[PDB]
Amino acid sequence: YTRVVWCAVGPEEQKKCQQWSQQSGQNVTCATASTTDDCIVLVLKGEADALNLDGGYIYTAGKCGLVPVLAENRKSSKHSSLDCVLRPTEGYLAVAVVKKANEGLTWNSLKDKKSCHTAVDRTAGWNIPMGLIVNQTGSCAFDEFFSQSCAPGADPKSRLCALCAGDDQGLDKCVPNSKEKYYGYTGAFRCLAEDVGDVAFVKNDTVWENTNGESTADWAKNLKREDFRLLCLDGTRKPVTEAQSCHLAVAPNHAVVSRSDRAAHVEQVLLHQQALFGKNGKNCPDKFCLFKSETKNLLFNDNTECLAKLGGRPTYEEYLGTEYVTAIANLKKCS
Amino acid sequence: LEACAF
Numbered sequence: 001y002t003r004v005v006w007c008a009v010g011p012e013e014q015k016k017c018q019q020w021s022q023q024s025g026q027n028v029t030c031a032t033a034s035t036t037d038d039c040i041v042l043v044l045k046g047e048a049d050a051l052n053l054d055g056g057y058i059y060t061a062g063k064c065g066l067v068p069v070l071a072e073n074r075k076s077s078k079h080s081s082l083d084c085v086l087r088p089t090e091g092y093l094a095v096a097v098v099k100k101a102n103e104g105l106t107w108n109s110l111k112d113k114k115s116c117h118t119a120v121d122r123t124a125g126w127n128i129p130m131g132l133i134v135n136q137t138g139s140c141a142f143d144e145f146f147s148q149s150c151a152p153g154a155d156p157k158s159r160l161c162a163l164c165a166g167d168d169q170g171l172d173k174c175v176p177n178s179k180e181k182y183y184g185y186t187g188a189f190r191c192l193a194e195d196v197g198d199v200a201f202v203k204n205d206t207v208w209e210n211t212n213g214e215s216t217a218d219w220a221k222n223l224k225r226e227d228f229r230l231l232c233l234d235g236t237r238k239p240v241t242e243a244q245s246c247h248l249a250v251a252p253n254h255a256v257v258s259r260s261d262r263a264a265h266v267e268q269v270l271l272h273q274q275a276l277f278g279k280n281g282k283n284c285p286d287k288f289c290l291f292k293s294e295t296k297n298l299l300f301n302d303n304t305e306c307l308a309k310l311g312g313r314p315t316y317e318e319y320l321g322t323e324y325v326t327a328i329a330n331l332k333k334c335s
Numbered sequence: 336l337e338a339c340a341f
């Protein structure tokens with residue numbers, strides 16, 4: 001049989017992959033690139049097999065011919081008697097988060113404020129809020145809307161990267177990988193927690209997972225949920241308990257993609273790997289846990305319960321949904 | 336809306 005070559009984005013994901021590889025007896029091995037788009041190109045070249053992707057990146061990958069294989073499934077809100085691998089996915093809630101103490105601020109007063117995004121091209125961090133903003137403003141100049149932002153993957157000299165902070169050395173300011181302090185869900189929430197920005201575009205789970213002692217990380221360990229508010233599109237502000245009535249969109253879950261001719265094999269191997277190292281896996285926490293990374297969401301989100309099988313052998317557009325695809329395509333006309 | 340970015 002053949003080995004599965006995973007693609008790690010940046011050096012923190014590489015280290016985790018290398019641990020997985022050792023534990024897997026080289027059933028999985030590792031390629032690494034500096035950005036998600038570069039890992040997508042390694043897969044298109046056949047130099048890696050697969051990686052797990054946010055839906056905005058699935059859009060890129062799917063325009064290039066890669067296909068969805070298995071999706072992240074977090075814990076369901078409702079009792080289900082189905083095994084995790086067979087439970088339908090629920091989608092996550094993209095939200096706009098602000099500090100409660102920043103009292104004037106609503107969706108309708110974002111212009112000229114400071115923003116924190118997960119990365120350019122990602123769902124909650126970029127496609128949904130900027131797609132909404134370009135539409136409501138009637139303008140493609142999304143790069144001149146906020147006074148300053150951290151939007152990993154934008155031009156590092158531009159206002160969209162001005163709040164980014166890079167690594168322990170200021171190296172790699174604004175790169176779209178975990179070496180940027182403000183990258184991803186937890187990075188963009190930290191940018192708001194620290195008052196670097198006025199608003200963060202993340203998902204509902206990020207706010208709960210990084211407050212009220214749910215994270216022991218230094219920057220998060222003392223944050224309280226009640227000190228944050230969600231911006232609803234009708235101009236109101238709500239406590240973070242009200243995400244089901246105050247969100248920007250429901251996003252498709254992150255999912256693994258591969259080339260079509262490797263998808264079946266990638267799927268079989270991941271199903272076995274999560275049986276060893278997944279949540280309650282045979283050898284997690286003893287040896288290695290595929291869905292943990294000290295809150296840093298490396299390779300997978302730390303809140304992944306399993307990777308689940310997809311219904312209907314979906315194309316990428318069927319997985320993302322026609323509404324979302326159409327929103328992305330509308331926004332990409334601006335660039 | 337049609338081609339690969341790379």
Ligand SMILES: *[C@@H]1O[C@H](CO)[C@@H](O[C@@H]2O[C@H](CO)[C@@H](O)[C@H](O)[C@H]2NC(C)=O)[C@H](O)[C@H]1NC(C)=O
Pocket residue numbers: 001023024025027272273276
């Ligand atoms: C590495 O992958 C191989 C192949 O899938 C696994 O070896 C198999 O183990 C299964 C399940 O225990 C058995 O059905 C077979 O006898 C083995 N198949 C072959 C082709 O040798 C192996 O268990 C995997 N190891 C790890 C650590 O993931």
Ligand SMILES: *[C@@H]1O[C@H](CO)[C@@H](O[C@@H]2O[C@H](CO)[C@@H](O)[C@H](O)[C@H]2NC(C)=O)[C@H](O)[C@H]1NC(C)=O
Pocket residue numbers: 075076077078093204205206208209214241242243244
């Ligand atoms: C917002 O996200 C949080 C975190 O994922 C959700 O709260 C969790 O929901 C699960 C499943 O119901 C509970 O068993 C967990 O204990 C909750 N976690 C925490 C830290 O409180 C919350 O349900 C989501 N809100 C909406 C509207 O979807």
Ligand SMILES: *[C@@H]1O[C@H](CO)[C@@H](O[C@@H]2O[C@H](CO)[C@@H](O)[C@H](O)[C@H]2NC(C)=O)[C@H](O)[C@H]1NC(C)=O
Pocket residue numbers: 127128131132135322323324326327330
């Ligand atoms: C931004 O506006 C565009 C243009 O209206 C939206 O695109 C429409 O979306 C609806 C719902 O899926 C479709 O019925 C229309 O046919 C789409 N119109 C066009 C011209 O393509 C897009 O959804 C909006 N973006 C966001 C994020 O809401």
Ligand SMILES: CCCCn1nccc1C(=O)O
Pocket residue numbers: 089090091092250251252253318319320321322
């Ligand atoms: C559940 C979030 C909605 C997005 N979505 N629309 C159609 C299919 C899907 C999903 O498969 O990820």
Ligand SMILES: [Fe+3]
Pocket residue numbers: 054055122123124251254
């Ligand atoms: Fe996402």
Ligand SMILES: [Zn+2]
Pocket residue numbers: 247249250
């Ligand atoms: Zn909704």
Ligand SMILES: [Zn+2]
Pocket residue numbers: 312313314315318
């Ligand atoms: Zn289909």
